[PDB]
């Protein structure tokens, strides 16, 4: 007997949670931009330490 009520609250939950899942992918890639573009150079030290 809950069948028509169930599919109407399933509409509100899926729309909300899909727009929260898409925004978390954008937010993660902005805060992770400095680590993916970090660089590294090696010059060997002069050897009598």
């Amino acid at each position: 007997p809950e069948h028509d009520e169930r599919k109407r609250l399933g509409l509100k939950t899926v729309i909300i949670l899909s727009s929260l899942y898409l925004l978390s992918i954008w937010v993660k890639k902005f805060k992770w931009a400095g680590i993916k573009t970090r660089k590294f150079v090696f010059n060997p030290p002069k050897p009598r330490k």
Partner: protein
Amino acid sequence: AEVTQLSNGIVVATEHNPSAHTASVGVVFGSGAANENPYNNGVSNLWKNIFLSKENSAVAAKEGLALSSNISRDFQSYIVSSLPGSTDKSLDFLNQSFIQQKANLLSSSNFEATKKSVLKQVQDFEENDHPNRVLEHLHSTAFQNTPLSLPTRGTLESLENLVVADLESFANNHFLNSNAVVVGTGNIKHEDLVNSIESKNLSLQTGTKPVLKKKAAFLGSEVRLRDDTLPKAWISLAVEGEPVNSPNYFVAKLAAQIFGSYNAFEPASRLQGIKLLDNIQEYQLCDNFNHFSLSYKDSGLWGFSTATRNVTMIDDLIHFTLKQWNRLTISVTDTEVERAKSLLKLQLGQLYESGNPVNDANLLGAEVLIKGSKLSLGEAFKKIDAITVKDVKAWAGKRLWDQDIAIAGTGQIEGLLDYMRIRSDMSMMRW
């Protein structure tokens, strides 16, 4: 203590002071290390040296004349110092072998002995002078791919690929008549210098130097040079600042005096009226710090520089300092503005009213090249007294509240966190 400019085609500035015992005469050019490309870098550092080379300075010591020079960004200088009844011999030394017959200084044996002395100054600088080679990397990472980032000494491989053909190529384009100011400070009248210059027809030829393709631009970045065999950690950090002839010039200098400088081993330094010193001294987070406000004709840099030996609590020293910067926007008090007014007038007075006429010749030559005339100490004191609390909060919310930073460090900097954990500290999130 009044300044006098008089252009007969050549700008001649002079501040007389008849209570001095010496007198300086030199020429200051308006092209510095920010007028070079990355292949002739540090070529002005080889023009200072060969002016101070041993065969050139032996000739000056036979008449009682001392030589001095200085290479920076936006200007260079070549000063000749003497006794106040002997300034006509000072012009004749600048005229010969620097202006007119400047060919015998650029020999093959005098150049080769000089270059291998400049090659060992920059090599000892790169291994020993840690608070000054970190501040150089702060200019190198904040203005990258832009004129304002080349080091004033040059680098070790840009100095090795430098031949004698490169120096006259630099002098032909930059030591011109309109890019030049002739200064004289100390015990010397303004009119005896002007007549003695135009007693001959001292001049130069062309003018209209090259016109500086790329402008200056700030970029948020960081550079890390970790060295685990050094016993300390050195760190600098800054934001964009106020340039020369900016309307917030004295307002940015007053803000750095609010936080000032510190030395942990001086007892009177630990008693200053700085609110940051309550958190520092509880666990002894550093050895020293100092706040600065650099300014050029393009932009500026506002920040601080530290050196610590507590290598496991580095992230608390950065956290507590950047939290106090937030208070300039939201909750700065009126007794902190009045304390920094008195200390700024004392710091400006000891730089512009010292006893060295060589020091006052680099200061006078820069302000006449970039503005045409000098600003008095009475007019600068009148401007500092008229700053309010509202002007500091209007400057701070524009320049430091939620803005990008530039970081540089060396030593045991493993405890220094990455960029976004430091970048988020530029807004308190309590306003």
